[PDB]
Amino acid sequence: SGFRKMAFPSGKVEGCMVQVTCGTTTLNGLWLDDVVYCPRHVICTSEDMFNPNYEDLLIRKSNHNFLVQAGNVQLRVIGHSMQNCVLKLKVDTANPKTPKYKFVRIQPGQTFSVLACYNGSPSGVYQCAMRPNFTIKGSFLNGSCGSVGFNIDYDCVSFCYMHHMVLPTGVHAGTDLEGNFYGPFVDRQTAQAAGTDTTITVNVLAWLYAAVINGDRWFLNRFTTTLNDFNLVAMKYNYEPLTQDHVDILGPLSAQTGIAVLDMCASLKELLQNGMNGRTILGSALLEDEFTPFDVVRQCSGVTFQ
Amino acid sequence: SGFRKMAFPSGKVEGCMVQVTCGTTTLNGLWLDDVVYCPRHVICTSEDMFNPNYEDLLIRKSNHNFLVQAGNVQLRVIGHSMQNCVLKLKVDTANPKTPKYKFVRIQPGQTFSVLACYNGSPSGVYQCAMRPNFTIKGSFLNGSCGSVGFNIDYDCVSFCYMHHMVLPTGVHAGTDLEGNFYGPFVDRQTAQAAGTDTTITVNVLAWLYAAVINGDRWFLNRFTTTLNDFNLVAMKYNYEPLTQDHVDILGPLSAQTGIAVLDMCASLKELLQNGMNGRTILGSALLEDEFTPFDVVRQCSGVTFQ
Ligand SMILES: *C(=N)[C@H](C[C@@H]1CCNC1=O)NC(=O)[C@@H]1[C@@H]2[C@H](CN1C(=O)[C@@H](NC(=O)C(F)(F)F)C(C)(C)C)C2(C)C
Numbered sequence: 123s124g125f126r127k128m129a130f131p132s133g134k135v136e137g138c139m140v141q142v143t144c145g146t147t148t149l150n151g152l153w154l155d156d157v158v159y160c161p162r163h164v165i166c167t168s169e170d171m172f173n174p175n176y177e178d179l180l181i182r183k184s185n186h187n188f189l190v191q192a193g194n195v196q197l198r199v200i201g202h203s204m205q206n207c208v209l210k211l212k213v214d215t216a217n218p219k220t221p222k223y224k225f226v227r228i229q230p231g232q233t234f235s236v237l238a239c240y241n242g243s244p245s246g247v248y249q250c251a252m253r254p255n256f257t258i259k260g261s262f263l264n265g266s267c268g269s270v271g272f273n274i275d276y277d278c279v280s281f282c283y284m285h286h287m288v289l290p291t292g293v294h295a296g297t298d299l300e301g302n303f304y305g306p307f308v309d310r311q312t313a314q315a316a317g318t319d320t321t322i323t324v325n326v327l328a329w330l331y332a333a334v335i336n337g338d339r340w341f342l343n344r345f346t347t348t349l350n351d352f353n354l355v356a357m358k359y360n361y362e363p364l365t366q367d368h369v370d371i372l373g374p375l376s377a378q379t380g381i382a383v384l385d386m387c388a389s390l391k392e393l394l395q396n397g398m399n400g401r402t403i404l405g406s407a408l409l410e411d412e413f414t415p416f417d418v419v420r421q422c423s424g425v426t427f428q
Numbered sequence: 429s430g431f432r433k434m435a436f437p438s439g440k441v442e443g444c445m446v447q448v449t450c451g452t453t454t455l456n457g458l459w460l461d462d463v464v465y466c467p468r469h470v471i472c473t474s475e476d477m478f479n480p481n482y483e484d485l486l487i488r489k490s491n492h493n494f495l496v497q498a499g500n501v502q503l504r505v506i507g508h509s510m511q512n513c514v515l516k517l518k519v520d521t522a523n524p525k526t527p528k529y530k531f532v533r534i535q536p537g538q539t540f541s542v543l544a545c546y547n548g549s550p551s552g553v554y555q556c557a558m559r560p561n562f563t564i565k566g567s568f569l570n571g572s573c574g575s576v577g578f579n580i581d582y583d584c585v586s587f588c589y590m591h592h593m594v595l596p597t598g599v600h601a602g603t604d605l606e607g608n609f610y611g612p613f614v615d616r617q618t619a620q621a622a623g624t625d626t627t628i629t630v631n632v633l634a635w636l637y638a639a640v641i642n643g644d645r646w647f648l649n650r651f652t653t654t655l656n657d658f659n660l661v662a663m664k665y666n667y668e669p670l671t672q673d674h675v676d677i678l679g680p681l682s683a684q685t686g687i688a689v690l691d692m693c694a695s696l697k698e699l700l701q702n703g704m705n706g707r708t709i710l711g712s713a714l715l716e717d718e719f720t721p722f723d724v725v726r727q728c729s730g731v732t733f734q
């Protein structure tokens with residue numbers, strides 16, 4: 123009963139957040155085993171930010187220059203290295219709260235939870251999607267860098283995002299946990315803009331299945347369509363092309379509801395061409411594209427985590 | 429930058445969730461110090477549900493009849509009692525992860541985070557409001573009872589909701605942690621319906637301030653209004669009356685933005701009378717009423733928790 127934007131429980135990630143200070147710059151780090159991962163611009167002064175030479179700035183730091191705090195406890199740094207846009211600080215204490223974890227690089231259209239943090243302390247949790255233009259629509263303030271995005275699978279935390287910056291129009295950009303940016307962005311205070319975004323078609327379809335499961339069925343029409351003819355219509359509305367891989371991922375929801383994917387595609391086609399006529403779907407007056415097929419299955423089936 | 433529906437970090441509550449089984453009925457419980465709190469209908473069979481005599485059903489239970497599991501560890505029950513609609517099971521082990529906490533009864537219009545759980549294991553977290561008709565718009569499945577709602581203030585978890593049932597139209601009903609229902613509902617499988625709901629005016633105003641803070645300002649008009657004349661208009665649109673207490677609670681946001689509350693009221697008046705004309709505010713095509721003034725301040729100022 124009901125359908126909500128739902129984040130993963132954040133406790134396993136909360137137990138990994140620390141504060142990292144270098145000079146007067148402070149941000150968040152992620153403490154897993156005996157390594158703290160954080161954005162490399164912790165080593166920048168305000169003026170370094172416009173054209174930083176991170177390798178040069180790091181040459182002039184030693185271990186003791188990094189103040190790492192886990193709650194009230196300072197963690198002694200005993201080694202450091204740079205990997206793309208992330209700093210790795212080896213500390214002399216392994217985090218006893220380290221969960222089973224993976225570093226993953228997610229694909230555009232996939233979702234994750236963000237644990238927004240300031241000064242190593244958690245503020246809140248929310249769900250995001252990696253947009254097709256490789257930005258995310260987050261909520262971040264000064265000092266939020268190093269906050270991470272993640273998914274959970276049973277007991278395993280898959281970390282997929284570390285926060286680095288905000289772009290014009292207010293969308294956000296960051297890296298995977300190997301320090302490689304999503305998209306064509308750099309960690310430098312320089313003129314940068316997101317490309318034009320697109321609507322994540324497979325997710326809109328997932329959310330229409332969630333509507334059917336939850337009893338909101340008014341938009342279901344009596345037609346079908348071919349994949350080619352659907353994509354011709356969707357392209358005009360700045361929807362991303364629907365692939366056979368997308369069709370296959372929708373299979374569980376199609377099987378559960380008894381509505382063929384291409385039938386749902388015909389109903390979406392009508393919504394795009396005619397609008398929703400003042401009506402809502404699952405309480406929204408716009409079509410929602412930040413629920414994946416798995417998000418819908420997980421919420422409508424009550425999948426839990428260890 | 430950005431504005432999202434944001435839940436509190438759930439870790440402090442995750443460390444309190446357990447599974448409670450009596451006979452063949454299983455639901456979630458909340459383990460604080462040496463007491464487990466859970467919905468009393470854990471003691472009901474399926475047929476007991478329609479007209480249960482909870483006092484009679486509990487007479488025929490003893491401590492050993494309650495199987496309480498915290499992960500892989502069974503907790504021995506050494507005492508039990510009923511308080512309104514909640515069962516309290518004394519166990520022989522105090523929860524070492526008990527946070528500082530309070531039991532509070534919230535008022536209609538206030539928000540909280542829900543940690544949805546199944547079989548004592550967390551599934552996800554989302555933000556809800558206590559509706560003026562004393563229901564909540566949650567997302568719950570079979571076995572979700574005993575999931576709790578809460579707010580956090582620094583290090584203190586204020587528990588305010590325990591989940592018990594779903595009503596027609598799919599809205600949800602439950603109790604405070606003293607077992608007293610919000611609203612005129614009973615924990616019995618009998619014909620019950622929520623009263624007509626109303627829109628939480630002070631929260632819509634809070635969210636318009638959040639829009640201004642985040643740069644979405646198109647709806648700001650050049651007028652003001654009196655409190656009386658605003659409430660005459662709002663009443664027609666099923667908005668709850670705006671009180672002086674509400675005006676006072678909006679004061680921090682008014683001071684931050686330099687927009688007097690009654691000026692924002694004039695802009696809301698225009699939105700109600702004319703609509704949004706295809707435009708969005710903070711990405712939504714409807715006016716949002718499940719952010720409190722404090723929710724907005726907490727998100728736009730980066731308040732963290734210990
Ligand atoms: C990390 N704590 C912050 C997070 C920012 C701050 C406000 N909202 C956020 O998401 N990261 C930064 O301040 C980064 C950082 C230098 C400057 N910066 C920016 O986000 C700037 N953006 C850009 O320069 C642009 F447009 F290219 F993205 C700023 C103008 C300050 C918003 C570095 C190393 C990129």
Ligand SMILES: *C(=N)[C@H](C[C@@H]1CCNC1=O)NC(=O)[C@@H]1[C@@H]2[C@H](CN1C(=O)[C@@H](NC(=O)C(F)(F)F)C(C)(C)C)C2(C)C
Pocket residue numbers: 123455469477568569570571572573574591592593594595596600614615616617618619620
């Ligand atoms: C607790 N695990 C469930 C949570 C429900 C289940 C599906 N979605 C939810 O939120 N609680 C119940 O099943 C409660 C419980 C008996 C029956 N019940 C209901 O929610 C029923 N609702 C009502 O009878 C009504 F309309 F009055 F609310 C049901 C028809 C099964 C949905 C008790 C003790 C009320």
